[PDB]
């Protein structure tokens, strides 16, 4: 009936979205950290290749290790520039839009949860619309609904409730009078009329919209209107803009999964850096033919397809640094040493060794 | 009087906090980007030093430039690890806590803004408590209150309404009956009693708290109670935990201003990397007394205080590159070249030259 407490078929959907939005910061955390860890891994690969080039100068595989090292430096570099330029705003924008909307929902839902008179007359009713609900654990009567933001630790959010299309549970309502509103449980929050709703001496001046422009409450003796948020299109100035915004933001996310954070397993001449380095340094001739790139590569790699890039990488990994550099009975092989700070210093030990030579050498 | 619409004294404070908490994402953005830009600048300095050590390999000036280059690599490296480990969660946590609380406030304030009957009876009143206020632009009658989250673009923001100790304007209220509540404007949201408040056939079951546990609304014919939020202590399970949380998070922020993102202008032996590199590579005597560190440094730097570190740095920034390595009419000096990707390339050209000179020589 109109101007009556809300039955679970109204509020369970909003609970689901609130609890799903709760994971958006956790996701943002996960991604921002994933981007640095990946930048770090590319850096580590370039450090390992550089150190091999320093130890093994004179050989051709040393020149190969420089091309490997420059590619991974460039990866590690474009990763940090992607983090700055794209990923930071994206995850901040997702975290903020989702949290602001979660706040809006939660305030409304906790109003309803609190405006009750008896255990059978109130604003928040069970499915049956026989009793009011009570929070127990992080559920409002069994339904998982904490109505507060959980502590942010990294993890991937689900997209069940907010998908690529909009809010799936916030479909159109055909019969709000019956499916949302109880037959008799009283709620003044259910209308804007002075009799069984929010008006005191009169109906209010106009319709009130609640939950960030989700539900409209009229000053007339009528039932609620809810927006269908399941098939959204981007808009501005929309009454339920918060909903649009959290959707649009979540929808724009790529994660630390773009090109820059992914390794390339194609042919050597195609890898980030190779052809342009071969033209500039080795060939000293710009805009050359793919064959003459292929040729130079065969000198260092023994070919030009991914299996020779790995073979060099294997040499780089098997390559051991001095025990004087890494501890006691500790792992000395480069493939077994990780950590930018650690590897940056092993590199400076060998950059120092290379200076020593060239002062006796020239 | 009790069970009456709220006068500007009550709501202007919440407007101020909502609007301040609007800048928290903008700040988070600003910092996350500031951290990458600073990591980038340290990297650029290590790239410039490395290239000088390459272009001049085998000298003591190249040996000095290696120590400079390893310090800046280590900075750039610990910056990305600080970004990952500390700054990411910090700014995500600040953005989410603030946005969730801004959502909670805004929903309450927009309820009040909407529950009005006449232009003189309602829930949101002016200071005089004579008229109901209205939202024009991003202001509800003069006082700035957009009641929505602004688009996130970078900004450094000075906290005035939320600061180190809590929410400044959310003071203990001595006389809510008079300073908050009007004499006669009607608001059902002002109590939980069935006569002029939210109860329908009866008072509600208990007190309702609103704005994330800020204001308590009793089922009795009484005036509102508001929490003093201006001298907070961290707590758990608190009725107004959102407030505590946004405070604690904002209070924990350091910004991209920690050690790792700041340059060190102390003596050379004290700089990040120098003594440990001198012991490991040059001295090959791990655990050497600072005088013998001072000595080695004099060989490269011509001393051991900050003015010699800069002099090397001057040489480094002076050092020109090959004309072909730069754009049509672009500068060739290292001090005049910025951009990790750009400099990573110049470094690989010279790493290749060193490769070729070492074999041309050996
Ligand atoms: C992009 O691809 C490169 C090449 O695979 C990655 O570098 C490699 O990273 C792994 C660790 O992730 C290192 O593996 C080592 O293998 C040895 C032998 O199997 C094992 O004993 C060690 O425990 C370790 O697993 C490998 O040495 C290293 N290779 C090079 C050339 O540095 C890089 O991490 C990838 N980047 C990203 C963002 O994933
Ligand atoms: C930490 O300190 C180092 C050393 O000051 C910074 O590197 C230096 O960065 C500046 C640009 O920020 C470069 O300055 C150049 O100066 C010349 C001559 O005055 C001028 O013509 C150029 O337009 C440019 O301003 C300088 O070359 C560079 N020095 C080195 C050795 O790389 C570094 O940026 C600081 N780090 C952070 C995070 O601020």
Residues of A in contact with B73 (CB under 8 A): 344, 347-348
Cα torsion A98, A102, A105, A110 to 10°: value is 180
Nearby residues of B287 by Cβ (< 8 Å), 6 or more positions away: B279
Domain boundaries, position A357: 34-85+256-362
Distance (Å, whole) CA A138 – CA B9: 35
B41 lines ligand 2 (CB under 6 A): yes
Domain boundary among A255, A286, A312: A255
Residues A129 and A277 in one domain: no
Tokens 């979540």 -> residue: A250
**Judging by DSSP bridges, how do beta strands B4-6 and B135-136 pair with one another?**
unpaired
Distance A42 CA to ligand 1 centre (A): 9
Residues B148 and B251 in one domain: yes
A26 lines ligand 1 (CB under 6 A): no
Question: Could you say which of A103, A206, A277 has the minimum Cβ distance to residue B104?
Answer: A103
B263 lines ligand 2 (CB under 6 A): yes
Residues A337 and A307 in one domain: yes
In what order do the strands lie in the sheet containing B208-210? Answer: B208-210, B215-217, B225-226
Residues A75 and A220 in one domain: no
Nearest residue (by CA) to ligand 1, atom 37, is: A41
Residues A266 and A350 in one domain: yes
Specify which residues A215 forms β-bridges with: A210, A226
For the domain that residue B5 is a member of, what is the CATH number?
A: 3.90.150.10
**Min distance B171 CA to chain A CA atoms (Å):** 22
Distance B317 CA to ligand 2 centre (A): 8
Residues A72 and A171 in one domain: no
Distance (Å, whole) CA A35 – CA A85: 12
φ, ψ for residue A4, nearest 5 deg: -120, 160
**Alpha-carbon distance values, A268 to A78, A277, A302, A310, B110 (Å):** 19, 12, 11, 10, 60
Distance A74 CA to ligand 1 centre (A): 17
Residues of B in contact with A362 (CB under 8 A): 58, 357, 361
- What is the chain A residue with the closest CA to B85? A33
For the domain that residue A313 is a member of, what is the CATH number?
A: 1.10.470.10
Question: Could you say which of A80, A276, A362 has the minimum Cβ distance to residue B40?
Answer: A80
Looking at the CA of residue A334, tell me the nearest atom of ligand 1: 27
Domain boundary among B212, B228, B255: B255
How was this one solved? X-ray
Note whether A12 and A186 are within 8 A (CB). Answer: no
- Resolution stated for this PDB structure, in Å: 2.9
Q: For a substitution probing ligand 1, which of A45, A62, A311 has the most ligand atoms within 8 Å of its CB?
A: A45
Which H or E element spans position B301? helix B290-301
Residues B7 and B155 in one domain: yes
Residues of B in contact with A74 (CB under 8 A): 341, 344-345
Residues A120 and A20 in one domain: yes
A271 lines ligand 1 (CB under 6 A): no
Note whether B107 and A109 are within 8 A (CB). Answer: no
Residues A174 and A323 in one domain: no
In what order do the strands lie in the sheet containing A225-226? Answer: A208-210, A215-217, A225-226
Report helix, strand or coil for B225.
strand
**Min distance A271 CA to chain B CA atoms (Å):** 14
Contact check, Cβ <8 Å, A50/B245: no
Looking at the CA of residue B317, tell me the nearest atom of ligand 2: 27
Domain boundary among A255, A285, A315: A255
- What is the chain B residue with the closest CA to A278? B349
Residues B230 and B289 in one domain: no
B317 lines ligand 2 (CB under 6 A): yes
Tally of domains within chain B: 2
For residue A247, the Cα-to-chain-centroid distance in whole angstroms is: 13
Residues B229 and B284 in one domain: no
Q: For a substitution probing ligand 1, which of A335, A337, A347 has the most ligand atoms within 8 Å of its CB?
A: A335
Residues A110 and A235 in one domain: yes
């Amino acid at each position: 009936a109109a101007e009556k407490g809300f039955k679970q078929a109204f509020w369970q959907p909003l609970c689901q979205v609130s609890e799903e939005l709760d994971d958006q910061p956790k996701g943002a955390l996960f991604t921002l950290q994933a981007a640095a860890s990946k930048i770090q891994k590319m850096r580590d690969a370039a450090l390992r290749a550089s150190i091999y080039a320093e130890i093994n100068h004179g050989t051709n595989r040393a020149k190969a290790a420089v091309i490997v090292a420059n590619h991974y430096a460039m990866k590690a570099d474009s990763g940090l520039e992607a983090l700055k330029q794209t990923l930071s705003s994206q995850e901040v924008t997702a975290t903020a839009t989702a949290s602001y909307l979660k706040g809006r929902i939660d305030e409304y839902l906790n109003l309803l949860l609190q405006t009750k008179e008896s255990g059978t007359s109130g604003c928040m009713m069970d499915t049956s619309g026989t009793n009011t609900v009570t929070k127990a654990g992080g559920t409002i009567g069994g339904v998982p609904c904490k109505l507060q933001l959980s502590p942010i630790q990294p993890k991937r959010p689900a997209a069940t409730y907010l998908g690529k299309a909009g809010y799936v549970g916030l479909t159109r309502q055909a019969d709000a009078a019956n499916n949302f509103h109880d037959n008799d449980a009283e709620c003044r929050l259910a209308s804007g009329h002075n009799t069984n709703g929010l008006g005191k001496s009169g109906q209010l001046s106009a319709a009130v919209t609640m939950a960030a422009g989700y539900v409209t409450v009229a000053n007339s003796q009528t039932a609620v209107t809810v927006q269908a948020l399941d098939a959204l299109q981007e808009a501005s100035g929309a009454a339920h803009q918060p909903w649009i915004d959290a959707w649009k933001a979540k929808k724009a996310l790529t994660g630390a999964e773009t090109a820059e954070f992914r390794n390339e397993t194609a042919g050597i001449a195609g890898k980030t850096g190779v052809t342009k380095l071969v033209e500039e340094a080795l060939l000293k001739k710009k805009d050359s033919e793919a064959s003459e790139i292929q040729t130079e590569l065969k000198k260092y790699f023994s070919g030009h397809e991914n299996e020779q890039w790995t073979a060099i990488e294997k040499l780089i990994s098997e390559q051991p640094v001095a025990q004087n550099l890494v501890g006691d009975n500790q792992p000395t092989k480069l493939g077994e040493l990780e950590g930018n700070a650690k590897l940056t210093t092993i590199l400076a030990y060998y950059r120092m060794e290379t200076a020593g030579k060239f002062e006796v050498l020239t």
